[PDB]
Design a binder for this molecule. Sequence first.
Ligand SMILES: Cc1cc2nc3c(=O)[nH]c(=O)nc-3n(C[C@H](O)[C@H](O)[C@H](O)COP(=O)(O)O)c2cc1C
Ligand SMILES: Cc1cc2nc3c(=O)[nH]c(=O)nc-3n(C[C@H](O)[C@H](O)[C@H](O)COP(=O)(O)O)c2cc1C
Ligand SMILES: [Cl-]
Ligand SMILES: [Cl-]
Ligand SMILES: [Cl-]
Ligand SMILES: [Cl-]
Ligand SMILES: [Mg+2]
Ligand SMILES: [Mg+2]
Ligand SMILES: [Mg+2]
Ligand SMILES: [Mg+2]
Ligand SMILES: [Mg+2]
Ligand SMILES: [Mg+2]
Ligand code: NA
Ligand code: NA
Lengths: 399, 399
Amino acid sequence: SFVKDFKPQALGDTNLFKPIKIGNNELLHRAVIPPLTRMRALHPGNIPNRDWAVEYYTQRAQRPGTMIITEGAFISPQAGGYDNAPGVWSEEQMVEWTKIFNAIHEKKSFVWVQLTVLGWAAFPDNLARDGLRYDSASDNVFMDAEQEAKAKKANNPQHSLTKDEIKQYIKEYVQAAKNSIAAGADGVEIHSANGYLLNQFLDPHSNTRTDEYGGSIENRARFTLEVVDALVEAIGHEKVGLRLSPYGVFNSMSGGAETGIVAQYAYVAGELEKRAKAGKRLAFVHLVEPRVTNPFLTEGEGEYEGGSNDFVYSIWKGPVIRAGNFALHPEVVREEVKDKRTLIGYGRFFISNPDLVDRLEKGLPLNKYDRDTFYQMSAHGYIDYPTYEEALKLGWDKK
Amino acid sequence: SFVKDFKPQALGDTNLFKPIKIGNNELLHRAVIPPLTRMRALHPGNIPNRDWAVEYYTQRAQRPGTMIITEGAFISPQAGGYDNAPGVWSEEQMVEWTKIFNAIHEKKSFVWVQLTVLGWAAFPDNLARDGLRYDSASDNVFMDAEQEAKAKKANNPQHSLTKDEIKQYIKEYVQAAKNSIAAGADGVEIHSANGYLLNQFLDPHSNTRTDEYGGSIENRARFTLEVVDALVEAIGHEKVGLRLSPYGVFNSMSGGAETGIVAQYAYVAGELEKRAKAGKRLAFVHLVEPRVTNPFLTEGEGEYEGGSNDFVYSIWKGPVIRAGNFALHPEVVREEVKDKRTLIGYGRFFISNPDLVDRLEKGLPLNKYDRDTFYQMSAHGYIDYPTYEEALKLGWDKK
Ligand SMILES: Cc1cc2nc3c(=O)[nH]c(=O)nc-3n(C[C@H](O)[C@H](O)[C@H](O)COP(=O)(O)O)c2cc1C
Ligand SMILES: Cc1cc2nc3c(=O)[nH]c(=O)nc-3n(C[C@H](O)[C@H](O)[C@H](O)COP(=O)(O)O)c2cc1C
Ligand SMILES: [Cl-]
Ligand SMILES: [Cl-]
Ligand SMILES: [Cl-]
Ligand SMILES: [Cl-]
Ligand SMILES: [Mg+2]
Ligand SMILES: [Mg+2]
Ligand SMILES: [Mg+2]
Ligand SMILES: [Mg+2]
Ligand SMILES: [Mg+2]
Ligand SMILES: [Mg+2]
Ligand code: NA
Ligand code: NA
């Protein structure tokens, strides 16, 4: 069915429908697919879904010149811990990714691989089964009681990374980025948001370290910036973006309750701009808005009203992708895209609307999403959401 | 004469004319007199002007319930270096300040003493004459070539403060704050702006230290925060505010060219909010806007368009006074005061309009200022600017 009560607005007369270049890619509009974990990868080996993933991405590439950021992809076994999320370390994985990238390109769209390392969000028992550590910044603060207890039961207590182990992750980021490019991706996004490992280092709640990787703003940002620099060196700044969620609380990050949180993220933005002014500007910065501090809460819930991401624009002078509850709020998008370097990520409603871009241009009704199938091993709720035309034929204009 | 071409707007229908409490003071409107050095203090001894200063402040206190921040006042001889700016360390000074504070209070207005330490902005030859150091954060970067050369000629080369000397300044801030309160002031403003000593510590251009007072965001903010904490302890948070100029370039500060500048100031704001949440909220934060990066340039010049102070409001949750080119821009003020904790400082046009508040409420013409008498040892251009009524009688509605 269509979302009831939603009053659509045609956005074709806004900058959302003006072309923009991101990295090497000439986008034809500024509606971006943000990274969306869907849990259709198959075990063993974290293999992108051999039956459905090509079709999923093909559908969502249908509007020419769309920027697609993939579901998060693990850079190595140790970086993972969800059996049904994909990786980008093995030949068997890359065979499937190559097909996905080719399909997106055939639709004249673009694809950026999000590179993910889970840290404390991983399942410690899966990791133990596979002979892997349960990692985070620290060893004395935990995501929640259940995770702490699972780790202990698995004889895999949370482990504070050594400097050598941080270096090993950086090597894996580099190789994962190389693999992604070699398989045909247009670029990569470094996931430093939503309470995963890099965010666990950024945040003073999760990072109680007293070495050079914690205990100050500069130290907490060190790992994220080392990954940025390693990937810029390996594949070029024009092929690298960075995702941040300053006000997020998902996965036990601090959000605005931490009075130093804006300074922490302002520091990262400033270091990005310093690199840019020295000739190595990242393709984009991708921000999760305080509009959505936890993406598993219904739109409108978990809104933090005490902060704005606007500060980033005073610092970083390149493209900025904003995501969080924009599909149901074209009136907000209309204002935000007046800034000529702003793009808008649409997550949950891209799950349910393969032709979302047409719907945004033309002010059409939106298909309701089905949260129960966000994570499910099924084509249902993955590749069977209709286009607007197909929905009309099903009679959704009445139902 | 009146400013030609200026199209006034009545602001009586805005929050500029709603009461607000700042510290212990019930203000009746939100037009604030920011600190304005006028150079009428007499030598020797940096004595507030015995002939004219009471009248100057009385005139500008005339609208009941006005918050006045004094001209900067030196906390000690070593903090000074301008012979015609006043101090607040001696009995002879406080005799004159007492008269000024009494006069402001008789007009049912309020007075906050700005506490000033010049650092590298001081004149090294005056300091040498008086047996005093020429101080800054560092000893290997200078305000400009002329200052460096003056210091060398005076056998008084710029000196990087020791930790003990920083402690001595803090003692002097404490005593100056006590003196101000005992003499009748409503509070004090810590000057950490416009490239004076505390700002020289905040800014990475001027602060090349490698001890705990430089080399990182936290270290560069340490001196400013130590002064905040010492004054909060001595006289109470409700009697203390702090002035900052994030984007200023006056006195060779970095401004927006420094990519880390927003993070530096965001850190200070966050530390202020942390203290506030722990029960010790400063009376206000006073920001110089990027609208005026150098207050000796004509309105509209030296405007930095690449940054906003809005970030501070995501962090600090108390009153904020904004200053910089607002008199000629009632349309901007109208928008800014929609925020219910925003006050507006009017500097140069309070020099020339003793009845500025009435003029703002009622949308009246503004007297042109005379920059040549901003700093001058004279009543002329100090206490002889007319009220609107007096200007009409002089025929300025025609001239
Ligand atoms: C099912 C689901 C999976 C998600 N997976 C990821 C992910 O892999 N990486 C990431 O950075 N964000 C992920 N997110 C967050 C989204 O990218 C997005 O920031 C968030 O859903 C807010 O945007 P929206 O309101 O348009 O959905 C996910 C969100 C959902 C609902
Ligand atoms: C003559 C003059 C003296 C000033 N003296 C001080 C001072 O003692 N302390 C301070 O913090 N700012 C001082 N300022 C800066 C003003 O407080 C104010 O921030 C600036 O003039 C911008 O506001 P305006 O455009 O309303 O004048 C001075 C400015 C001028 C023009
Ligand atoms: Cl799993
Ligand atoms: Cl995520
Ligand atoms: Cl002088
Ligand atoms: Cl000043
Ligand atoms: Mg242990
Ligand atoms: Mg169902
Ligand atoms: Mg499910
Ligand atoms: Mg020396
Ligand atoms: Mg003259
Ligand atoms: Mg003069
Ligand atoms: Na099938
Ligand atoms: Na006289």
